[PDB]
Amino acid sequence: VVLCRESQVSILQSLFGERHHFSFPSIFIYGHTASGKTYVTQTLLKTLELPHVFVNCVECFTLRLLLEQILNKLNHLSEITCETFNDFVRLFKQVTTAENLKDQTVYIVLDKAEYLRDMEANLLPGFLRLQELADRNVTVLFLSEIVWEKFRPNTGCFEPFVLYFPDYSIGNLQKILSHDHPPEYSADFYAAYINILLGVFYTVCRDLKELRHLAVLNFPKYCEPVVKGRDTRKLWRNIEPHLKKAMQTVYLRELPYYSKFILIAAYLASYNPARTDKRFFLKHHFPLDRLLAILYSIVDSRVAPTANIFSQITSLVTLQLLTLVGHDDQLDGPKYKCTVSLDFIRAIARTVNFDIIKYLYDFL
Amino acid sequence: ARRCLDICRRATEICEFTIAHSMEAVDEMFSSSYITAIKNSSVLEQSFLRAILAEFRRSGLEEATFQQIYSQHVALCRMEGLPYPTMSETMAVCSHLGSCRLLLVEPSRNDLLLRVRLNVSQDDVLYALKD
Amino acid sequence: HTECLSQVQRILRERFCRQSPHSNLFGVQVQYKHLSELLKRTALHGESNSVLIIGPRGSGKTMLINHALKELMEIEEVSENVLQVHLNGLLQINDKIALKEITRQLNLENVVGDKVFGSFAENLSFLPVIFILDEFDLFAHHKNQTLLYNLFDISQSAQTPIAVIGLTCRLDILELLEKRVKSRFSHRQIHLMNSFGFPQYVKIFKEQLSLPAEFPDKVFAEKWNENVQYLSEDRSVQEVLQKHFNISKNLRSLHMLLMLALNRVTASHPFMTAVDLMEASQLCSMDSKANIVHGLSVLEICLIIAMKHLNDIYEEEPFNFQMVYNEFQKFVQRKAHSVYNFEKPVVMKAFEHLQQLELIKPMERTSGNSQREYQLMKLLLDNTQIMNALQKYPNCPTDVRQWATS
Ligand SMILES: Nc1ncnc2c1ncn2[C@@H]1O[C@H](COP(=O)(O)OP(=O)(O)OP(O)(O)=S)[C@@H](O)[C@H]1O
Ligand SMILES: Nc1ncnc2c1ncn2[C@@H]1O[C@H](COP(=O)(O)OP(=O)(O)OP(O)(O)=S)[C@@H](O)[C@H]1O
Ligand SMILES: [Mg+2]
Ligand SMILES: [Mg+2]
């Protein structure tokens, strides 16, 4: 069922008219992430009982897969293998002549169409004007998150009818969340739950799926106090800290000794300009050699250049903590970059008993 | 010789309908149709072209971003008293103009940062727009 | 009653959606006369000709050819001798596929052979047949223009009569051809421009929505004609038509607008209304960017305002995540105790979502070498657009509004 979705359904039903009637060649529907584009159109197609083929662009990452899946599903509605778009057109013309497919409109629903512009140059224009080429009462629908402005080819093509799905509001979200109430408690209880949850999280999280997931996760802790023995104040006081702890994470859901010194030296080399290096290390007044010199200066003990330190360097490179810049074949002048957050390096320096802030030129 | 024979054939065709026939054949089968296409353009397209020319005169460069062109178009519309145009309408007009190779643009991905170059000489545009 | 409404719905849907042929032609008398005369010359005699038709997309290029063919094929038994081949630049992208289509449409695969052998002298040696070429510009981008050259050669040859018709939206189709084919190309051009005034546009609108004389009910048809005639001079309808005529003179948009208007025609309202046309025009002329901005959340709005401030302070320069985060922190710290205590990861996720919606685009794309942080981003919006969208925001708080104004 659909809630707070009555204008778009009525518009689509008026557009379709009767089965023997014709319609637009191309309709482009765009909206936000949680607008329910997939739900509404699929429920409408199931209700009207129309011959429709549902296709995911991501699943059909190759042209042959797309055409073969379309043809196979259409045949099942009524093995076939095709390779070129012209062959697909010819086979579609051959297959559409069924009695069940004689005086009825054929619908090809495509979702996640954002990748279609990266598949082939002429595939999208061909799909746009399918009804002219086939001349067989065919309609093609588009679902996407990007506006039509960026789907326009350079040469220009047959403009589809553009449609927008309205964004949700507080009342609509509350109604949708309160529809699927658990049967073991009163509807007003779940309504109050949804109300407090929205009052806490609506500022950031407007995603229906995410908010519903959060409600499902946190309901068991909501229902504990009454089990333990309609007390709004009692429930709110018992439940507030848990809600704050949950809001701490909305969207989120021990190195070796010398490795720490290597990491801190790499951070210093990356974020400190070379001109000041001696100013921080020379007792009197990035390339690999600079790193080695800085490491030798920092460590109070004399470290021998054993191969194990080079193995540590390569292991750190593999662990995606240090990024290699130069060519892989050039292993005599290699370049490196450090990608560690500053809080992490401060924590590791604290565990090492080292004060990195005293050496950071930018902070000084 | 081939185009001479073509001109003679076209002159015979027109005479079916003097030197005027040959002149019509030669100036129809050789002359460029850019001027008449510009003349038969719409009012908004004319305003867009005037805005492009004004921006080029102000700057002197042969490449201009879509944002400055849009600003000049808005100023020209305010001067002319025309209703305030949306960005989408201007982009649609730009795409339509670029389709017939009157301009040069790659609006497939970039929208507000499109380089625009005139595909015809500026004096031809001036002679088409003076009338 | 209901049956008449269903029938008129079907007829108008066929007229608009499928673009069924109609005897009415507007401002194309000379061009159609010339083209039909030349087709008759090429059919009744062995002479060959080559013509290109140049026009903006949606200006009824195909209609001229279809009407001319339906007019002239049925004249005599010439249709028995005449053969037609249709080639579209979209379906046939390679010369091999074009050759396969030509062989299959001519039913010579039995004569030529079934295998993939590249020899085509079977047709070439054997080669009245007419050729129609949709999207003629695409063929000029082939590796050697072999098909176009061969077609022009056989047109100029004295073996068999061949008529070549091309369709193009580009006005520079002459310079996309090589010198040889250009020399062998008969300089026959027809131009399809919407050379008519606003009153003629109003007449076209009045005629297009007029029921044909073959409808069963006659008094209902007369009432419909009177209704559309009355709606013709209504100043709101004329205002809508003036707006759309200023926007574009293409008939395809007019057909789309009329179809959308007719969609709202029900049993309770058998005859349209000017308010219906106003509603259709409003529905056709809304900007998507403002809608997308309106569909955002509070945090995204704050980030966008910070981005606008960065663009104002640093004139036309890129930026990264760290500067935006720092100045958002400055904004939330200047205010005493506002409820905006958010950590780094959630703001990072919001920035990722904003980049996903393609309101922000990277410069000189690379990955691995540069993280998502420290990446040069730019905004794809205008200040007036942000102000207008923020004005219509449902529940914009006072603090963020004043920060935006500042
Ligand atoms: N208007 C609605 N009425 C009832 N349930 C809805 C509505 N909108 C969304 N839902 C529910 O929310 C679920 C998730 O929404 P989706 O259908 O995934 O949104 P979407 O617009 O299709 O975005 P994508 O394309 O999947 S990323 C659906 O499966 C429905 O159960
Ligand atoms: N002079 C005209 N007289 C009558 N109808 C016209 C005229 N010009 C355009 N039309 C109509 O305009 C509508 C759109 O034309 P189309 O047939 O889509 O364009 P086209 O000829 O296919 O050109 P392209 O480049 O191939 S899309 C059709 O319904 C035509 O009947
Ligand atoms: Mg979906
Ligand atoms: Mg066409």
CSV table of N, CA, C and O in Angstrom, one decimal, chain B residues 55-109:
chain,number,residue,atom,x,y,z
B,55,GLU,N,29.1,40.7,-24.1
B,55,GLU,CA,30.2,40.2,-23.2
B,55,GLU,C,31.5,40.1,-23.9
B,55,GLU,O,32.5,40.4,-23.4
B,56,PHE,N,31.5,39.7,-25.2
B,56,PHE,CA,32.8,39.6,-26.0
B,56,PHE,C,33.4,41.0,-26.1
B,56,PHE,O,34.6,41.1,-26.0
B,57,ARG,N,32.6,42.0,-26.4
B,57,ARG,CA,33.1,43.4,-26.6
B,57,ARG,C,33.6,43.9,-25.2
B,57,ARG,O,34.6,44.5,-25.2
B,58,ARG,N,32.9,43.5,-24.1
B,58,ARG,CA,33.4,44.0,-22.8
B,58,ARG,C,34.7,43.3,-22.5
B,58,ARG,O,35.6,43.9,-21.9
B,59,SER,N,34.9,42.0,-22.8
B,59,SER,CA,36.1,41.3,-22.5
B,59,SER,C,37.2,41.3,-23.5
B,59,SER,O,38.3,41.5,-23.3
B,60,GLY,N,36.8,41.0,-24.8
B,60,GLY,CA,37.7,40.9,-25.9
B,60,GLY,C,38.1,39.5,-26.2
B,60,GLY,O,38.8,39.3,-27.2
B,61,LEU,N,37.8,38.5,-25.3
B,61,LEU,CA,38.1,37.1,-25.5
B,61,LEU,C,37.1,36.4,-26.4
B,61,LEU,O,35.9,36.8,-26.5
B,62,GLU,N,37.5,35.3,-27.1
B,62,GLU,CA,36.7,34.5,-27.9
B,62,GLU,C,36.1,33.3,-27.1
B,62,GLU,O,35.4,32.5,-27.7
B,63,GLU,N,36.4,33.2,-25.9
B,63,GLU,CA,35.8,32.2,-25.0
B,63,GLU,C,35.2,32.8,-23.8
B,63,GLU,O,35.9,33.7,-23.1
B,64,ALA,N,34.0,32.4,-23.4
B,64,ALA,CA,33.3,33.0,-22.3
B,64,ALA,C,32.6,31.9,-21.6
B,64,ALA,O,31.9,31.0,-22.2
B,65,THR,N,32.6,31.9,-20.2
B,65,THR,CA,31.8,31.0,-19.4
B,65,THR,C,30.3,31.3,-19.5
B,65,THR,O,29.9,32.4,-19.9
B,66,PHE,N,29.5,30.2,-19.3
B,66,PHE,CA,28.1,30.4,-19.4
B,66,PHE,C,27.5,31.3,-18.3
B,66,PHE,O,26.4,31.9,-18.6
B,67,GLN,N,28.2,31.5,-17.2
B,67,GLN,CA,27.7,32.3,-16.1
B,67,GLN,C,27.6,33.8,-16.5
B,67,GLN,O,26.6,34.5,-16.3
B,68,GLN,N,28.7,34.3,-17.1
B,68,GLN,CA,28.7,35.7,-17.5
B,68,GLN,C,27.8,36.0,-18.6
B,68,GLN,O,27.1,37.0,-18.7
B,69,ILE,N,27.6,35.0,-19.5
B,69,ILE,CA,26.7,35.1,-20.6
B,69,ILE,C,25.3,35.2,-20.0
B,69,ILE,O,24.4,36.0,-20.5
B,70,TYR,N,25.0,34.3,-19.0
B,70,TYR,CA,23.7,34.4,-18.4
B,70,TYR,C,23.4,35.7,-17.7
B,70,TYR,O,22.3,36.2,-17.8
B,71,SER,N,24.4,36.3,-17.1
B,71,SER,CA,24.2,37.6,-16.4
B,71,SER,C,24.0,38.7,-17.4
B,71,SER,O,23.1,39.5,-17.2
B,72,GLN,N,24.7,38.7,-18.5
B,72,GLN,CA,24.4,39.6,-19.6
B,72,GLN,C,23.1,39.5,-20.2
B,72,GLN,O,22.4,40.5,-20.5
B,73,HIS,N,22.6,38.2,-20.4
B,73,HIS,CA,21.3,38.0,-20.9
B,73,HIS,C,20.2,38.5,-19.9
B,73,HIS,O,19.2,39.0,-20.4
B,74,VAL,N,20.4,38.3,-18.6
B,74,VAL,CA,19.5,38.8,-17.6
B,74,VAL,C,19.4,40.3,-17.7
B,74,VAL,O,18.3,40.9,-17.6
B,75,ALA,N,20.6,41.0,-17.8
B,75,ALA,CA,20.6,42.4,-17.9
B,75,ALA,C,19.9,42.9,-19.2
B,75,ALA,O,19.1,43.9,-19.1
B,76,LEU,N,20.1,42.2,-20.3
B,76,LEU,CA,19.4,42.6,-21.5
B,76,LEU,C,17.9,42.4,-21.4
B,76,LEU,O,17.1,43.2,-21.9
B,77,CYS,N,17.5,41.3,-20.8
B,77,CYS,CA,16.1,41.1,-20.6
B,77,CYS,C,15.4,42.1,-19.7
B,77,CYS,O,14.3,42.6,-20.0
B,78,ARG,N,16.1,42.6,-18.6
B,78,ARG,CA,15.6,43.6,-17.8
B,78,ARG,C,15.5,44.9,-18.6
B,78,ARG,O,14.6,45.7,-18.4
B,79,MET,N,16.5,45.2,-19.4
B,79,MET,CA,16.5,46.4,-20.3
B,79,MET,C,15.3,46.3,-21.2
B,79,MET,O,14.6,47.3,-21.4
B,80,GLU,N,15.0,45.2,-21.8
B,80,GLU,CA,13.9,45.0,-22.8
B,80,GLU,C,12.6,44.8,-22.1
B,80,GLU,O,11.6,44.9,-22.8
B,81,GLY,N,12.5,44.6,-20.8
B,81,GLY,CA,11.3,44.4,-20.1
B,81,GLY,C,10.7,43.0,-20.2
B,81,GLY,O,9.6,42.8,-19.8
B,82,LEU,N,11.5,42.1,-20.8
B,82,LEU,CA,11.0,40.7,-20.9
B,82,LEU,C,10.9,40.1,-19.5
B,82,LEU,O,11.6,40.5,-18.6
B,83,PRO,N,10.1,39.0,-19.4
B,83,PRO,CA,10.0,38.4,-18.1
B,83,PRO,C,11.3,37.7,-17.7
B,83,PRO,O,12.1,37.3,-18.5
B,84,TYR,N,11.5,37.5,-16.4
B,84,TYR,CA,12.7,37.0,-15.8
B,84,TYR,C,12.9,35.5,-16.3
B,84,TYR,O,12.0,34.7,-16.1
B,85,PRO,N,14.0,35.2,-17.0
B,85,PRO,CA,14.2,33.8,-17.5
B,85,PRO,C,14.9,32.9,-16.5
B,85,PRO,O,15.8,33.3,-15.7
B,86,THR,N,14.4,31.6,-16.4
B,86,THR,CA,15.1,30.7,-15.6
B,86,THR,C,16.4,30.1,-16.2
B,86,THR,O,16.6,30.3,-17.4
B,87,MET,N,17.2,29.5,-15.4
B,87,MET,CA,18.4,28.9,-15.9
B,87,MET,C,18.1,27.8,-16.8
B,87,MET,O,18.8,27.6,-17.8
B,88,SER,N,17.1,27.0,-16.5
B,88,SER,CA,16.8,25.8,-17.4
B,88,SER,C,16.4,26.2,-18.8
B,88,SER,O,16.8,25.6,-19.8
B,89,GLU,N,15.6,27.3,-18.9
B,89,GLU,CA,15.2,27.8,-20.2
B,89,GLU,C,16.4,28.2,-21.0
B,89,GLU,O,16.6,27.9,-22.2
B,90,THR,N,17.3,29.0,-20.4
B,90,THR,CA,18.5,29.4,-21.0
B,90,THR,C,19.4,28.3,-21.5
B,90,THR,O,20.0,28.3,-22.6
B,91,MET,N,19.6,27.2,-20.6
B,91,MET,CA,20.3,26.1,-21.0
B,91,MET,C,19.7,25.3,-22.2
B,91,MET,O,20.4,24.8,-23.1
B,92,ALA,N,18.4,25.2,-22.2
B,92,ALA,CA,17.7,24.6,-23.3
B,92,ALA,C,17.9,25.3,-24.6
B,92,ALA,O,18.1,24.7,-25.6
B,93,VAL,N,17.8,26.7,-24.5
B,93,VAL,CA,18.1,27.5,-25.7
B,93,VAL,C,19.5,27.3,-26.2
B,93,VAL,O,19.8,27.2,-27.4
B,94,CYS,N,20.5,27.2,-25.2
B,94,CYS,CA,21.9,27.0,-25.6
B,94,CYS,C,22.1,25.7,-26.3
B,94,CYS,O,22.8,25.6,-27.3
B,95,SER,N,21.4,24.6,-25.7
B,95,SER,CA,21.5,23.3,-26.3
B,95,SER,C,20.9,23.3,-27.7
B,95,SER,O,21.5,22.7,-28.7
B,96,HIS,N,19.8,23.9,-27.9
B,96,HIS,CA,19.2,24.0,-29.2
B,96,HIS,C,20.1,24.7,-30.2
B,96,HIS,O,20.2,24.3,-31.4
B,97,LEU,N,20.7,25.8,-29.8
B,97,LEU,CA,21.6,26.5,-30.7
B,97,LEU,C,22.8,25.7,-31.0
B,97,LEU,O,23.3,25.7,-32.2
B,98,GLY,N,23.4,25.0,-30.0
B,98,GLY,CA,24.5,24.2,-30.3
B,98,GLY,C,24.2,23.0,-31.1
B,98,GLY,O,25.2,22.4,-31.8
B,99,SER,N,23.0,22.5,-31.2
B,99,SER,CA,22.6,21.4,-32.0
B,99,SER,C,22.8,21.7,-33.5
B,99,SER,O,23.2,20.8,-34.2
B,100,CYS,N,22.5,22.9,-33.9
B,100,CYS,CA,22.6,23.3,-35.3
B,100,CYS,C,24.0,23.9,-35.6
B,100,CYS,O,24.2,24.5,-36.7
B,101,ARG,N,25.0,23.6,-34.8
B,101,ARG,CA,26.4,24.0,-35.0
B,101,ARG,C,26.5,25.5,-35.3
B,101,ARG,O,27.3,26.0,-36.1
B,102,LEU,N,25.7,26.3,-34.6
B,102,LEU,CA,25.9,27.8,-34.5
B,102,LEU,C,26.9,28.2,-33.4
B,102,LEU,O,27.5,29.3,-33.6
B,103,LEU,N,27.0,27.4,-32.4
B,103,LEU,CA,28.0,27.6,-31.3
B,103,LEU,C,28.9,26.4,-31.1
B,103,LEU,O,28.8,25.4,-31.8
B,104,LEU,N,29.7,26.4,-30.0
B,104,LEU,CA,30.5,25.3,-29.7
B,104,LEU,C,30.5,25.1,-28.2
B,104,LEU,O,30.9,26.1,-27.5
B,105,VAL,N,30.1,24.0,-27.7
B,105,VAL,CA,29.9,23.7,-26.3
B,105,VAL,C,29.9,22.3,-26.0
B,105,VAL,O,29.6,21.5,-26.9
B,106,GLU,N,30.1,21.9,-24.8
B,106,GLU,CA,30.0,20.5,-24.3
B,106,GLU,C,29.2,20.4,-23.1
B,106,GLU,O,29.7,20.2,-22.0
B,107,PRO,N,27.8,20.6,-23.2
B,107,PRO,CA,27.0,20.7,-22.1
B,107,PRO,C,26.5,19.4,-21.5
B,107,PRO,O,25.6,19.4,-20.6
B,108,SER,N,27.1,18.3,-21.9
B,108,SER,CA,26.7,17.0,-21.4
B,108,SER,C,26.9,16.9,-19.9
B,108,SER,O,26.1,16.4,-19.1
B,109,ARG,N,28.1,17.3,-19.4
B,109,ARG,CA,28.4,17.2,-17.9
B,109,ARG,C,28.5,18.6,-17.3
B,109,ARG,O,27.8,18.8,-16.2
